[PDB]
Design a protein around this ligand. Structure first.
Ligand code: 2QK
Length: 260
């Protein structure tokens, strides 16, 4: 029975659902037995940039509440020199853990999910945020709706329970020596996964070879034929290596796959 107070409200810890570094995530209950997620960061051991990255994510999360329900809700928060508590809506499971259950995916639900994702990413792009880290774990399933969790700004924690370079756009790699199109590529890999059960480059074990294959236009991404030909078209337009050629999000919003 470990509790937490945030802005004068007590929450009881059900379990820890993720942790890393100076930070933790818990499922909690208020006194009315309503469930929430609480994200905790210990600033006492936090570094400086962790601090500013964490102030930026919180402000953006707050600003964007009004604009989309495909962004996770921040109900309240507390910041001190010592700690951060963030009280957020609690979801059922993240999209990465659910895809690992290896079950059939309803093509109708795959497209409903794809829609939610596009809506959430489109919303952050409208405010000038390009996520750059998009992965299934950035998405939370709440009442059959996908909701975006983070903005890619603050660093990450790692999931806990009681029981990857794969999404990297070729631009990012050549950049070793940023476009909203970067998110399209990553989103593309995610839809690719909900379609073919694997990521485009997943097969390559050696990470050097894999980073090369992503940037090598002579490396052909497979697109097996499937009942939905328009989905197949979405995959191909998301997965073009040339960001200028790659489809944008507002176009993806108008595509037959989500509109029909
Ligand atoms: C692990 C850190 C990670 N997640 C969060 O920050 C975060 C924030 C708000 C949230 N509301 N609900 C969740 C959530 C609830 C359930 C859930 O799945 C459960 C628990 C774990 N297992 C293995 C399956 C069943 C997953 C999430 C929630 C999570 C994080 C994610 C993206 C970007 C940054 C960070 Cl720190």
């Amino acid at each position: 029975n470990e509790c937490i107070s945030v802005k004068g409200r007590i929450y009881s810890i059900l379990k820890q659902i993720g942790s890393g570094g100076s930070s933790k995530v818990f499922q909690v209950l208020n006194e009315k037995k309503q469930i929430y997620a609480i994200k905790y960061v210990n600033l006492e051991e936090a570094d400086n940039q962790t601090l500013d990255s964490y102030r930026n994510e919180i402000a953006y999360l707050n600003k964007l509440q009004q604009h989309s329900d495909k962004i996770i809700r921040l109900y309240d928060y507390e910041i001190t020199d010592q700690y951060i508590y963030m009280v957020m809506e609690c979801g059922n499971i993240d999209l990465n853990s659910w895809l690992k259950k290896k079950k059939s995916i309803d093509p109708w639900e795959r497209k409903s999910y794809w829609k939610n994702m596009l809506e959430a990413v489109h919303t952050i792009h409208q405010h000038g945020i390009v996520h750059s880290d998009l992965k299934p774990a950035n998405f939370l399933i709440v009442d059959g709706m996908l909701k975006l969790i983070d903005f890619g700004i603050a660093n990450q924690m790692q999931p806990d329970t009681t029981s990857t370079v794969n999404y990297m756009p070729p631009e990012a790699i050549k950049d070793m020596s940023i476009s909203p199109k970067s998110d399209v590529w990553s989103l593309g890999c995610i839809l690719y996964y909900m379609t073919y059960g694997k990521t485009p480059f997943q097969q390559i074990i050696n990470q050097i070879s894999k980073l090369h294959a992503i940037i090598d236009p002579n490396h052909e991404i497979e697109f097996p034929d499937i009942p939905e030909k328009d989905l197949q078209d979405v995959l191909k337009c998301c997965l073009k290596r040339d960001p200028k050629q790659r489809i944008s999000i507002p176009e993806l919003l108008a595509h037959p796959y989500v509109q029909i």
